[PDB]
Amino acid sequence: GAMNSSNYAELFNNDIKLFVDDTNVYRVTVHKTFEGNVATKAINGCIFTLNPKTGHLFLKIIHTSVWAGQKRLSQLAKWKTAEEVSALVRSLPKEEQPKQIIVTRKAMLDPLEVHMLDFPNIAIRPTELRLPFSAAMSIDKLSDVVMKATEPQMVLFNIYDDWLDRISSYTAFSRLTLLLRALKTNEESAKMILLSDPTITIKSYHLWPSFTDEQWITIESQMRDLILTEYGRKYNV
Amino acid sequence: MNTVPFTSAPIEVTIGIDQYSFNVKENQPFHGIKDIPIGHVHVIHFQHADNSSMRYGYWFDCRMGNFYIQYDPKDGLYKMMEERDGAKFENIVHNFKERQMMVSYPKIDEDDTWYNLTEFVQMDKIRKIVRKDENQFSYVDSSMTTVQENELSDPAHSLNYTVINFKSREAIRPGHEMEDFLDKSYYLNTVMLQGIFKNSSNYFGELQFAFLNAMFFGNYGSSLQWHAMIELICSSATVPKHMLDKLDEILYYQIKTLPEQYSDILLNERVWNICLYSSFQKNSLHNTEKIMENKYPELL
Numbered sequence: 001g002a003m004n005s006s007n008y009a010e011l012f013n014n015d016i017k018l019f020v021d022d023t024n025v026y027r028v029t030v031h032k033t034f035e036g037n038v039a040t041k042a043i044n045g046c047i048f049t050l051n052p053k054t055g056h057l058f059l060k061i062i063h064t065s066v067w068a069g070q071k072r073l074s075q076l077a078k079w080k081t082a083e084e085v086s087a088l089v090r091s092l093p094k095e096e097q098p099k100q101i102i103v104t105r106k107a108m109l110d111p112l113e114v115h116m117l118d119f120p121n122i123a124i125r126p127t128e129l130r131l132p133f134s135a136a137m138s139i140d141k142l143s144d145v146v147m148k149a150t151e152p153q154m155v156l157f158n159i160y161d162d163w164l165d166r167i168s169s170y171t172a173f174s175r176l177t178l179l180l181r182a183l184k185t186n187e188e189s190a191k192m193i194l195l196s197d198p199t200i201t202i203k204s205y206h207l208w209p210s211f212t213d214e215q216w217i218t219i220e221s222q223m224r225d226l227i228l229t230e231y232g233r234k235y236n237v
Numbered sequence: 238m239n240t241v242p243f244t245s246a247p248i249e250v251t252i253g254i255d256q257y258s259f260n261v262k263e264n265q266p267f268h269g270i271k272d273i274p275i276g277h278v279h280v281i282h283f284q285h286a287d288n289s290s291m292r293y294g295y296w297f298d299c300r301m302g303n304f305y306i307q308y309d310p311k312d313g314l315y316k317m318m319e320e321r322d323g324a325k326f327e328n329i330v331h332n333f334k335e336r337q338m339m340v341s342y343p344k345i346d347e348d349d350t351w352y353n354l355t356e357f358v359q360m361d362k363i364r365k366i367v368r369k370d371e372n373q374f375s376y377v378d379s380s381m382t383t384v385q386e387n388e389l390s391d392p393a394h395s396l397n398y399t400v401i402n403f404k405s406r407e408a409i410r411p412g413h414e415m416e417d418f419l420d421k422s423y424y425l426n427t428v429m430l431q432g433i434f435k436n437s438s439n440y441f442g443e444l445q446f447a448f449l450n451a452m453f454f455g456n457y458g459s460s461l462q463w464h465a466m467i468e469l470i471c472s473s474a475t476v477p478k479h480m481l482d483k484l485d486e487i488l489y490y491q492i493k494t495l496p497e498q499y500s501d502i503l504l505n506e507r508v509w510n511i512c513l514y515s516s517f518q519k520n521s522l523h524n525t526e527k528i529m530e531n532k533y534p535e536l537l
């Protein structure tokens with residue numbers, strides 16, 4: 001069944017599961033042609049496949065060449081996503097394969113279902129949550145690897161850095177979704193908060209800065225304030 | 238012209254014969270149905286006046302034997318039986334006709350409705366969907382489930398329709414996931430037509446038989462089967478031209494004959510809107526589209 005606020009802690013039990021977000025797979029800039037018509041130009045994209053318990057992120061980079069000479073690209077993007085997720089599952093040892101894949105957009109259900117027919121015991125689930133995984137390209141080292149890629153490439157990251165040494169998965173996922181929600185709602189301000197202080201650095205082997213526990217509390221409060229303000233503006237409340 | 242005599246009519250019942258129906262009162266001197274056109278299958282069906290649930294009935298073909306109906310007070314229903322003594326049967330039928338105790342199959346000469354609804358339906362195929370090999374006729378009722386329904390519980394009493402499942406290995410070639418799911422032509426033409434049904438006539442016969450079971454008995458699984466077989470054709474980009482033309486005629490008469498009051502439960506909105514307006518074959522079912530629009534514009 002669908003994943004929602006009510007069964008939220010299922011994400012952090014010991015059944016292997018993956019979120020799959022396809023929102024950055026097919027990315028375009030829109031521009032005018034010499035004749036004054038509109039055209040798109042694709043840029044590199046990515047599938048965001050995330051184990052919310054461990055933080056492991058399988059970032060499959062989608063090179064613009066995959067679209068060459070293809071029609072109905074937004075529909076193709078969903079099947080390409082499902083093809084690559086299915087290939088990822090096949091590549092994993094049996095004991096690492098997920099028991100559930102949760103797609104962030106319901107239009108991925110049928111493509112993934114069809115690509116996963118060989119895994120009848122892997123449940124493909126939609127979600128009612130409005131997760132901010134589109135903002136993954138606001139994380140500088142993920143954006144940098146996607147844009148620099150010259151060919152299809154699968155790269156492994158831990159999106160929680162070392163946080164799990166000190167906090168639980170539930171708390172780690174809440175921090176991640178807060179940071180991403182903030183980056184989605186007002187990227188410039190969120191990034192200002194994260195990097196204002198030059199003395200706090202990002203480890204060469206990490207995605208986020210090396211905050212102490214106390215600094216994280218301050219950071220998290222600043223992201224909350226950001227998100228609430230932006231909202232009052234959105235709705236004039 | 239053939240006859241299905243009735244031993245008696247002990248309980249009040251509405252009797253249908255093909256698309257016709259008559260009311261018979263408790264212990265009314267009714268003794269059967271004559272002038273049944275040879276050359277087609279037929280269905281004789283029943284709904285008791287006391288129990289408007291479980292419509293039931295029998296598919297038969299008078300070229301395959303002499304059949305009659307007899308009420309069974311233990312099992313509480315009108316049962317079809319075969320009379321193997323041909324002299325004894327002719328004698329009974331001649332006496333009942335002489336005494337004019339039989340209704341006449343009420344075919345108008347101009348009317349091809351029943352032919353058009355049963356064009357591809359064969360008794361030999363019905364008896365493979367309804368397995369009861371000791372009888373030459375086949376019982377169907379409102380409640381019988383299909384094999385596909387069972388997979389998702391008595392096998393002897395199931396409808397063994399061909400299983401169609403758009404998200405199945407059978408339907409989807411490895412490496413053609415997107416192609417085969419969006420264009421079902423290879424599942425239609427190779428898997429189903431060439432492989433399982435062998436020809437389009439057998440496919441159309443099962444489709445027509447499923448529709449008739451849905452209409453006459455309100456058999457829900459039959460209704461599912463009918464719509465699935467429609468959707469498989471409409472969702473294929475490559476369909477022989479003769480099949481599309483014939484499908485348009487098949488569906489036209491099915492929609493024409495459907496009771497107006499039953500369109501809500503017997504017609505699936507999604508399948509019809511997709512077949513007539515979104516699918517590859519949206520422009521290939523002109524007669525069917527025209528009667529649907531003029532008779533059920535609400536559904537669409």
Ligand SMILES: O=C(NC[C@@H]1CCCO1)NC1CCCC1
Binds near residue numbers: 141156157158205206
């Ligand atoms: O490669 C690791 N991290 C993944 C990328 C590198 C930049 C950040 O994300 N870490 C390994 C090196 C030492 C520990 C394991």
